[PDB]
Write a protein that binds this ligand. Structure first.
Ligand SMILES: [Zn+2]
Ligand SMILES: [Zn+2]
Lengths: 48, 114
């Protein structure tokens, strides 16, 4: 009861602003993905 | 190795022993046709059996639109650049990822494996 009636003051939500990252993070993620795909390609070449 | 057939009944020739001249004779069970063989080996069993598919690869696979193509591997015979390639495409192969190549130039059909 106490926490609910206090939460009536602070509030809570979830949204796109909470699910969106920053440009630097997007660059990091894309770099990591490209490196991983390149490494998989290298492994396939060595196997062939 | 192979199967050889009698010329009279056209049945399989089983090996029969000639206990007089110490020689091998192929004889059938339908008529009394005899023969002398050149293999001199009744039975052969290889358990490795790592057959190179270059005998079993058809040259007609070059017309497949779903196969990858490369131009960094020119054909040994006709020097054509583009050459289809694929993997072993064999079941009962314990482990294999080697590539196989077929030249895409018509009537060349060169099938190698670097
Ligand atoms: Zn016969
Ligand atoms: Zn060729």
């Amino acid at each position: 009861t106490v926490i609910n009636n206090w939460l009536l003051i602070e509030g809570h939500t979830i949204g796109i602003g909470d699910s969106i990252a920053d440009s630097k993070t997007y660059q990091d993620i894309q770099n990591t993905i490209k490196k991983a795909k390149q490494d998989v390609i290298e492994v396939i070449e060595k196997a062939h | 190795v192979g199967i050889r057939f009698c010329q009279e009944c056209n049945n399989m020739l089983y090996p029969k022993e000639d206990k007089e001249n110490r020689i091998l004779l192929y004889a059938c069970r339908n008529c009394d046709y005899q023969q002398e063989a050149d293999n001199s080996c009744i039975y052969v069993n290889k358990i490795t059996h790592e057959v190179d598919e270059l005998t079993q690869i058809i040259a007609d696979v070059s017309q497949d639109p779903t196969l990858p193509r490369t131009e960094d591997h020119p054909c040994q015979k006709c020097g054509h650049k583009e050459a289809v390639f694929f993997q072993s495409h064999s079941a009962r192969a314990e482990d294999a990822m080697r590539l196989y190549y077929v030249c895409t130039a018509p009537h060349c059909g060169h099938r190698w494996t670097e």
